[PDB]
Amino acid sequence: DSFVIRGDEVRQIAPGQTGKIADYNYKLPDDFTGCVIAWNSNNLDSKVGGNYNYLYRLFRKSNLKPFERDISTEIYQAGSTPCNGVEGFNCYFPLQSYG
Amino acid sequence: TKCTLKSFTVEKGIYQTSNFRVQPTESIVRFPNITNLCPFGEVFNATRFASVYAWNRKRISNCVADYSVLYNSASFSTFKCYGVSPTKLNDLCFTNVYADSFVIRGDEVRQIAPGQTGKIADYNYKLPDDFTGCVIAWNSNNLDSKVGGNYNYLYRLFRKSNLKPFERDISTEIYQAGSTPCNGVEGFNCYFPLQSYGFQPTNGVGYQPYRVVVLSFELLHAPATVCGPKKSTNLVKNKCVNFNFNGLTGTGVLTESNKKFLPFQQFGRDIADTTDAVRDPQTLEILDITPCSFGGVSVITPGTNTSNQVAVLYQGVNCTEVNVFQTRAGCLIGAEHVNNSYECDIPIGAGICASYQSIIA
Amino acid sequence: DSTECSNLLLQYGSFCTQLNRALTGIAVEQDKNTQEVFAQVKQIYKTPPIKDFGGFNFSQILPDPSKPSKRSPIEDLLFNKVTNGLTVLPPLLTDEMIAQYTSALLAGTITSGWTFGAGP
Amino acid sequence: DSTECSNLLLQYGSFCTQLNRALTGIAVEQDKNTQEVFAQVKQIYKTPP
Amino acid sequence: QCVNLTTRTQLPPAYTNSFTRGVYYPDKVFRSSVLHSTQDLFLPFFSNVTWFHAIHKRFDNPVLPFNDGVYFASTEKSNIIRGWIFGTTLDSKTQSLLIVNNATNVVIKVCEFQFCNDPFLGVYYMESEFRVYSSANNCTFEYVSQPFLNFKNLREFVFKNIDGYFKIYSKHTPINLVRDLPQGFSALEPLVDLPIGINITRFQTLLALHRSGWTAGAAAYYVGYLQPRTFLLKYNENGTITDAVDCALDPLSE
Amino acid sequence: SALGKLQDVVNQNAQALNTLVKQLSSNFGAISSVLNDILSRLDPPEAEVQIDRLITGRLQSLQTYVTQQLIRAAEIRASANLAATKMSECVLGQSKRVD
Amino acid sequence: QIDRLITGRLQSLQTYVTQQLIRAAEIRASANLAATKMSECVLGQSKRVD
Numbered sequence A: 001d002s003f004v005i006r007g008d009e010v011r012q013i014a015p016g017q018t019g020k021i022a023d024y025n026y027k028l029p030d031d032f033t034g035c036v037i038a039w040n041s042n043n044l045d046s047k048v049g050g051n052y053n054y055l056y057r058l059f060r061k062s063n064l065k066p067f068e069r070d071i072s073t074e075i076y077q078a079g080s081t082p083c084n085g086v087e088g089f090n091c092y093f094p095l096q097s098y099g
Numbered sequence B: 001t002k003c004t005l006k007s008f009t010v011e012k013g014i015y016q017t018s019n020f021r022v023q024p025t026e027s028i029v030r031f032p033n034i035t036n037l038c039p040f041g042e043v044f045n046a047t048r049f050a051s052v053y054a055w056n057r058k059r060i061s062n063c064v065a066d067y068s069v070l071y072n073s074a075s076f077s078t079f080k081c082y083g084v085s086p087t088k089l090n091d092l093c094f095t096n097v098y099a100d101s102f103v104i105r106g107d108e109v110r111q112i113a114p115g116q117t118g119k120i121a122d123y124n125y126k127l128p129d130d131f132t133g134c135v136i137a138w139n140s141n142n143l144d145s146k147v148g149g150n151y152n153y154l155y156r157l158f159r160k161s162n163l164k165p166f167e168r169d170i171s172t173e174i175y176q177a178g179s180t181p182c183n184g185v186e187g188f189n190c191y192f193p194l195q196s197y198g199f200q201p202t203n204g205v206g207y208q209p210y211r212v213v214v215l216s217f218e219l220l221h222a223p224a225t226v227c228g229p230k231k232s233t234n235l236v237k238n239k240c241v242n243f244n245f246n247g248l249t250g251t252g253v254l255t256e257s258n259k260k261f262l263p264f265q266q267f268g269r270d271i272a273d274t275t276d277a278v279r280d281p282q283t284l285e286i287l288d289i290t291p292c293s294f295g296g297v298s299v300i301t302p303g304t305n306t307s308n309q310v311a312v313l314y315q316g317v318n319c320t321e322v323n324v325f326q327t328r329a330g331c332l333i334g335a336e337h338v339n340n341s342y343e344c345d346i347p348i349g350a351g352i353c354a355s356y357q358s359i360i361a
Numbered sequence C: 001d002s003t004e005c006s007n008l009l010l011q012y013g014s015f016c017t018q019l020n021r022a023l024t025g026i027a028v029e030q031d032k033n034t035q036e037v038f039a040q041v042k043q044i045y046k047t048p049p050i051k052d053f054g055g056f057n058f059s060q061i062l063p064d065p066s067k068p069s070k071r072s073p074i075e076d077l078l079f080n081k082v083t084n085g086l087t088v089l090p091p092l093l094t095d096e097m098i099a100q101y102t103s104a105l106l107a108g109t110i111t112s113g114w115t116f117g118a119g120p
Numbered sequence D: 001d002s003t004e005c006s007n008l009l010l011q012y013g014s015f016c017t018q019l020n021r022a023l024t025g026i027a028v029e030q031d032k033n034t035q036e037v038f039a040q041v042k043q044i045y046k047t048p049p
Numbered sequence E: 001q002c003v004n005l006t007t008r009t010q011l012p013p014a015y016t017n018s019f020t021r022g023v024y025y026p027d028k029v030f031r032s033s034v035l036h037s038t039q040d041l042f043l044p045f046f047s048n049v050t051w052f053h054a055i056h057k058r059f060d061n062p063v064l065p066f067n068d069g070v071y072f073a074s075t076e077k078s079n080i081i082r083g084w085i086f087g088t089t090l091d092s093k094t095q096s097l098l099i100v101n102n103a104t105n106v107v108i109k110v111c112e113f114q115f116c117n118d119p120f121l122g123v124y125y126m127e128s129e130f131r132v133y134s135s136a137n138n139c140t141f142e143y144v145s146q147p148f149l150n151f152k153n154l155r156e157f158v159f160k161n162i163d164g165y166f167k168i169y170s171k172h173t174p175i176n177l178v179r180d181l182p183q184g185f186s187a188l189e190p191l192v193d194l195p196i197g198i199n200i201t202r203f204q205t206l207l208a209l210h211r212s213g214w215t216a217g218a219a220a221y222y223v224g225y226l227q228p229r230t231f232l233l234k235y236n237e238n239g240t241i242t243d244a245v246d247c248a249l250d251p252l253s254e
Numbered sequence F: 001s002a003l004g005k006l007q008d009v010v011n012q013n014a015q016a017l018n019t020l021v022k023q024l025s026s027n028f029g030a031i032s033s034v035l036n037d038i039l040s041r042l043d044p045p046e047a048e049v050q051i052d053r054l055i056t057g058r059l060q061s062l063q064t065y066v067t068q069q070l071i072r073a074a075e076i077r078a079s080a081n082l083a084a085t086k087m088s089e090c091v092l093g094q095s096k097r098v099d
Numbered sequence G: 001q002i003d004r005l006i007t008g009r010l011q012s013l014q015t016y017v018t019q020q021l022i023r024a025a026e027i028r029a030s031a032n033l034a035a036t037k038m039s040e041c042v043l044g045q046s047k048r049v050d
Ligand SMILES: *[C@@H]1O[C@H](CO)[C@@H](O[C@@H]2O[C@H](CO)[C@@H](O)[C@H](O)[C@H]2NC(C)=O)[C@H](O)[C@H]1NC(C)=O
Pocket: C051, C057, C058, C059, C060
């Protein structure tokens, strides 16, 4: 399973962690067997003007299952008011890019 | 029975195979009356707000806070939290809340943020890097603004050093822009630090006055007086339900009780320290908690060489709570009760025995 | 009723089955003990209606017709002087049938001597 | 004599009371056994001189 | 406003026997006809409790160490004892707790107070004299409640500081004994739990003067100290504690 | 104290059942003796450890109860065998055995 | 560390108490037999063979 994350989020690629990408992007099971590999890629995955090609799910209704992928680009309802697929007050896109 | 005995042939007899459970049907959560609300009406919707150099700090403590009304209000143009979640404000508990109320310009609304550098951030209101709580901001052009210009809202423009987090500075010391000595006398390079805003109704979005209330939470070793609201449901009696009374949870049948509690007592215990009596927090009445009718499921059968007919005994279970016969041992289903007396073939209990001749008891 | 607790309890294997089987063995052993002690006769004997035993009085040990439990006065005094997944199984022989067995033994040893224990 | 050990041991409940009760029962059972075996007479008989 | 009281008569403090007093309910749990063994801060049976008088010229208002808890017994007539002073340094440097019962209600405040050296109230023969503090700077908790109150009344109180919770237990008893504590059993009901979260190591009783200089009304009170021990409490059919056993008093009760 | 022998058996059985009930109130080194509090206050990776401590403590208590019940069952079986022998030899016949 | 030592020593003590209970039951059976021999062989003449 290959992805690109932040430097402080490498602790969240682990079983039993509480975190943001652990809950809404990539979840590992409690009985996970295998190895997590992380290495710095500032020379390749960064641009001086800002590399915005890597996105994470800021908003979701519920935490994921282990080995579950969510690519649905549906709007999130953060308030009592329904959003009807349109951004607005308390209506945010779930996918935000790293700067 | 074949599954339990790990064999495809079952000898004549009674075999305890399973455990009948009365499954809980409803969940009943009873919590006491939501009174002594926190005074958020006099902070968010006060008559006159304060300036940003002298922001009003209101201490919210010893009360229950309904953040759902604040979150669901559509008047607020900015609701950004930096240490907690907006949907979990009604679930968490905090020792106290500091409410910082002030008015700023529309372009400076972003300056109330951790790690943000601006004139309001450095000289008027500073937040820490590990700030917890939520910043709420809303437009107030219809109230604060005046056609002649509202100059009542001042802000600090100059100071030698940046602010510490949660620090006020209401001093009116004359700033030294240059290096010339100033003894409180204004000059070419000595100006008054507090300047007035230019709030006018003809201004566009960005120069309109915005009222900002910042809630900060404290989680010290003091007791958590500030908690979220409790949504008590209706009370259902005479059914095996999951009860949650003032943080005491369990599963049971809640019936009326003849035990007269003293007014300071809430729960009731037997010799074996199990909660068998409780007081409802909404209405001060006493309820007995009878455990649900758990029982053992036993299978009474002859040999599989003889017949495949079986009977089921639910031990200590009344027949109305599950060829149905009520015994003192329990409810027996599948056996025809007869008035004749024979020798005991398969023991049921309490003087009841079963035999094959169909299965009779 | 915690499902996570039962899922963790399944890691320990068949300990619960062993505990249940041991308790079941004890429970059937109690009924076997009562069967061996009291059910030593297969004929239910009764005393004659006339209690003419040559001056010997057995009213304190024979069953009392006035009492609904059909117990002797001594047996009635004896019964008066004795005061989360848990279930209590009832005994196979009720107190009335144990009293009936003792009544049959008393009637046999009064009317027939030791002959009823060795034959007819 | 460790008070921290006893404080941690109190978390386990009444195991120690159970073990002490069982040992006390065995200890009184031994005296009951000797009483049953040897004290079968209430008169101290003596042989003639 | 503060006033030094310089007309006192020097006398050593008295001591007397606690008998079987000072028992309170350890929890909010009803128990019926059962014996419950509990480990808590309890007052020892037949212990040596300090006896203070208010008689005319005696006016006993010293500052005493709080220790782990305070049992306050009051043989009271005409309501001389009105409240208590709780704190560590009893000045504006730290934060102190004030309990007062004036002519209308009871007020409980946790603030930074400047206590007088001799704090008291006063009744003119009408209450028109309050000299217990000079300032109040930083308040964190205020609570106004219903009034708690030959010697005719006996007032028992238990004050505890556990996990930042201040437990006040109290009991009113009608007595007709002239001088000492009566011998009997009375379990103290829980009255109020306070979320204070502050350090308290010292306390001081608040009395009331009688003006017609000053005169001290006839009152007597007793201070006992709570120690961690085990009690065996008996609960009757109606659920009140009618008798108790101190497990560390004598081998019979053990 | 005439019927002390039966009362002792009744008291021992009731006291053993009461002790088995009271063993549920002990946390056995966990943060709480209630499974609901652990499941509501902690995530499953640490709640698994706390529940495991409660499980091993309660299992040890239940094994202790079953073992002492088996020992008492052996004693009661010996007493019942003696009672059956007295029923056969003293009631159903005249015994020459002294005492 | 004390939790590990406590559980080990408690298991050892429970094992010892269980063994003592079984041996006490055996000695009680032997003592009941000895009391029976005292009643039937010393205090009377027994017709029971061996
Ligand atoms: C056998 O014994 C019983 C009880 O010892 C005798 O019944 C008593 O009879 C007298 C006079 O008839 C009454 O005053 C007593 O109250 C009776 N006692 C009881 C317990 O009921 C009985 O008379 C004796 N004889 C026979 C032939 O039955």
